[PDB]
mmCIF file of C-alpha atoms in Angstrom:
data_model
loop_
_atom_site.group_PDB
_atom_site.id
_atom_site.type_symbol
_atom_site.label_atom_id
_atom_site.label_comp_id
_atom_site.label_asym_id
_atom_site.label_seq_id
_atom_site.Cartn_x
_atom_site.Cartn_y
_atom_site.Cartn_z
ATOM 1 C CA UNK G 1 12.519 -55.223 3.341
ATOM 2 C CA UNK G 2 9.232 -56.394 5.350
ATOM 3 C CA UNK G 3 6.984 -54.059 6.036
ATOM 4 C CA UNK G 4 6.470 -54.074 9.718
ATOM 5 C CA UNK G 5 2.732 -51.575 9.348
ATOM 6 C CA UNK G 6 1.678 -48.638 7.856
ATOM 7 C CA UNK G 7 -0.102 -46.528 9.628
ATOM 8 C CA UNK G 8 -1.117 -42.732 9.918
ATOM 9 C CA UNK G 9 0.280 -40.382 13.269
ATOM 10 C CA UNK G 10 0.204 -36.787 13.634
ATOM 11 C CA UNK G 11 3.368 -34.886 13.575
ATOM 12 C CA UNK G 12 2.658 -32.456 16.255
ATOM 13 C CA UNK G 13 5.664 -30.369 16.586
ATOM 14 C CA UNK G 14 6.493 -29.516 12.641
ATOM 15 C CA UNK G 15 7.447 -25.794 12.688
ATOM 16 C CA UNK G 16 5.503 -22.740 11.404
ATOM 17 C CA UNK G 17 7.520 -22.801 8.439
ATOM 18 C CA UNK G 18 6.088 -26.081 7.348
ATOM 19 C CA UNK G 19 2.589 -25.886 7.634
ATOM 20 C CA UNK G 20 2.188 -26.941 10.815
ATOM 21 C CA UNK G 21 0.655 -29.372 12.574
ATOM 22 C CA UNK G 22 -0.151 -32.340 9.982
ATOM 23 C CA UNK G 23 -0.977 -35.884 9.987
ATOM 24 C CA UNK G 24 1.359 -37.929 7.328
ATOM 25 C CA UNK G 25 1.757 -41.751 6.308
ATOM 26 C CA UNK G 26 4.413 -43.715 8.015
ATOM 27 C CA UNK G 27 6.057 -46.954 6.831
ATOM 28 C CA UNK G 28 8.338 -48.532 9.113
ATOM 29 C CA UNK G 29 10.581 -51.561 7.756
ATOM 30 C CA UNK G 30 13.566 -52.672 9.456
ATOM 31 C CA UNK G 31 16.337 -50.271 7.647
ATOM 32 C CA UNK G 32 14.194 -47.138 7.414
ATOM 33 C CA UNK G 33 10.828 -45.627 8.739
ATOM 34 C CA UNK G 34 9.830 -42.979 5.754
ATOM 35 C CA UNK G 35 7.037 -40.698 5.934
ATOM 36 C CA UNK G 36 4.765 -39.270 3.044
ATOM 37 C CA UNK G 37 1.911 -36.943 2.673
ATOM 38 C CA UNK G 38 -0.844 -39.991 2.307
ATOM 39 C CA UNK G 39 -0.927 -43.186 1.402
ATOM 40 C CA UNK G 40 -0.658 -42.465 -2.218
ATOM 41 C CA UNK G 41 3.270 -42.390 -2.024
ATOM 42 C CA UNK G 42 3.235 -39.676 -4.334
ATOM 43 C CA UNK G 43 5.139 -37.360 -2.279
ATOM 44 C CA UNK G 44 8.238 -38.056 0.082
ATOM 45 C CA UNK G 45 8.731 -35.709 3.102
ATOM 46 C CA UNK G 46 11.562 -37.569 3.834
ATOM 47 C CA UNK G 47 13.761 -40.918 4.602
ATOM 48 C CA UNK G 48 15.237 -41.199 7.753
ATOM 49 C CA UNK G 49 17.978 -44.349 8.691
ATOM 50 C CA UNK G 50 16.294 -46.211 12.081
ATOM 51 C CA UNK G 51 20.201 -45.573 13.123
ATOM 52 C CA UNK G 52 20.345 -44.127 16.496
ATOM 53 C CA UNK G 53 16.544 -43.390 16.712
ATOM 54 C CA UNK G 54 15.913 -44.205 20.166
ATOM 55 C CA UNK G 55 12.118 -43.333 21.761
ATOM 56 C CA UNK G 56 11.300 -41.277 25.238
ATOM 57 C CA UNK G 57 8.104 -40.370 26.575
ATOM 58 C CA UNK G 58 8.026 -37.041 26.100
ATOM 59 C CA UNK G 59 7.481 -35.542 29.614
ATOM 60 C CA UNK G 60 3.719 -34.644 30.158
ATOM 61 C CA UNK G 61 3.815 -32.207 26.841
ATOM 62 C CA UNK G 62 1.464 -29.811 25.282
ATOM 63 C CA UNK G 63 -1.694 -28.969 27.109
ATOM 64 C CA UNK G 64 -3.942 -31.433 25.003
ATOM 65 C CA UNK G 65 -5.770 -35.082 25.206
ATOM 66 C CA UNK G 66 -2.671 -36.470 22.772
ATOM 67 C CA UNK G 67 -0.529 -38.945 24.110
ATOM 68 C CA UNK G 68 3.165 -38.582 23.383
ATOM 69 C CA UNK G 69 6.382 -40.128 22.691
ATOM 70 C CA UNK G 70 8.969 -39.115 20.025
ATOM 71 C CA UNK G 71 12.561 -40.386 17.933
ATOM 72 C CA UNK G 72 15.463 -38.402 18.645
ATOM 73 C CA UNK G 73 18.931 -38.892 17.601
ATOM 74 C CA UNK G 74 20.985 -40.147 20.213
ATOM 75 C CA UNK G 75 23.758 -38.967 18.738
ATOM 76 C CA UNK G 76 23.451 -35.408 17.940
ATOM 77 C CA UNK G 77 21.522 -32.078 18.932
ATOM 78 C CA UNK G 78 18.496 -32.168 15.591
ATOM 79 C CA UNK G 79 17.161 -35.867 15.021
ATOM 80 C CA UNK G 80 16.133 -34.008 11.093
ATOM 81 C CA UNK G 81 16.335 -30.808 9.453
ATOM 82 C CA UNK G 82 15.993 -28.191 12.438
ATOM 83 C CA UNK G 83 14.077 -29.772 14.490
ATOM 84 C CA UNK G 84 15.851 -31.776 17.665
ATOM 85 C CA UNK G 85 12.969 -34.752 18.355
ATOM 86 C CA UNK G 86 10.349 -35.805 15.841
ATOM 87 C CA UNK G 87 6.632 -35.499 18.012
ATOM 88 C CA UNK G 88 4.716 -38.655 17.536
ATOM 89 C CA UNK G 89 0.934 -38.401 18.945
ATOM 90 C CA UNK G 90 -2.098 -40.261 19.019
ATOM 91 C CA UNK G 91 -5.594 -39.765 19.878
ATOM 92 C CA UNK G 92 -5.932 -42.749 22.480
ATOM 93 C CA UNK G 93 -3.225 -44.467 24.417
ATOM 94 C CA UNK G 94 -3.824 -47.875 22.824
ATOM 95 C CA UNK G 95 -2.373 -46.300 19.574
ATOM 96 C CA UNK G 96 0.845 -45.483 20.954
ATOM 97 C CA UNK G 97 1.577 -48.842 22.635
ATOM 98 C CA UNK G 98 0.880 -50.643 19.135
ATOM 99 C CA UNK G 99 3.117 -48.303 17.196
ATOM 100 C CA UNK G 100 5.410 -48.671 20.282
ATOM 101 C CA UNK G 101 5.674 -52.565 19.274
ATOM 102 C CA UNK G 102 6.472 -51.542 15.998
ATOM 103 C CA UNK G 103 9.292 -49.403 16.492
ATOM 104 C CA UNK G 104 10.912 -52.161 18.951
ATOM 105 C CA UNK G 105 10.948 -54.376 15.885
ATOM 106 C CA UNK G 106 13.115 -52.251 13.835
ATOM 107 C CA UNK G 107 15.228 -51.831 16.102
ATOM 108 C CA UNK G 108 14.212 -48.163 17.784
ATOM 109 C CA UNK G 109 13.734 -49.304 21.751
ATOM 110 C CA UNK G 110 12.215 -47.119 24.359
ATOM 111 C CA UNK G 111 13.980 -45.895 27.883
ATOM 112 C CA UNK G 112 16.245 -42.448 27.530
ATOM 113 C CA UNK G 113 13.126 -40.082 28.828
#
């Protein structure tokens, strides 16, 4: 029910097939983190239960200045869709340790790397 923040991040690994690369609007509550296009909530890429979404840092990754960690269902082989983890990146590493805080909130804690 309480919004915990709202906040834009930069889904890095979202297939060919999907435009690519693209930055979306994330709401995080404690029963569901959703994400939109923008902040017009106009849109609805999709709504995802915080059940089983755990958080790893993502080992090194892409060749890039973006820091990464991601959700993936503990629980089975594609966390959405086709897709097996959900990248999360941000531009500076102070980013990621506030959204970090957010996630442990809801109930998504880190560890399983």
């Amino acid at each position: 029910i309480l919004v915990i923040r709202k906040g834009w991040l930069t889904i890095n690994n979202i297939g060919i097939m999907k435009g690519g690369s693209k930055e979306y609007w994330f709401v995080l509550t404690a029963e569901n983190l959703s994400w939109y296009k923008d902040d017009e909530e106009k849109e609805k890429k999709y709504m995802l239960s915080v059940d089983n979404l755990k958080l790893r840092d993502v080992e090194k990754g892409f060749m890039s200045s973006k820091h990464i960690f991601a959700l993936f269902n503990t629980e089975q082989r594609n966390v959405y869709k086709d897709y097996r983890q959900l990248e999360l990146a941000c531009e500076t590493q102070e980013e990621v340790d506030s959204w970090k805080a957010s996630f442990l909130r809801a109930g998504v804690y880190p560890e399983r790397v």
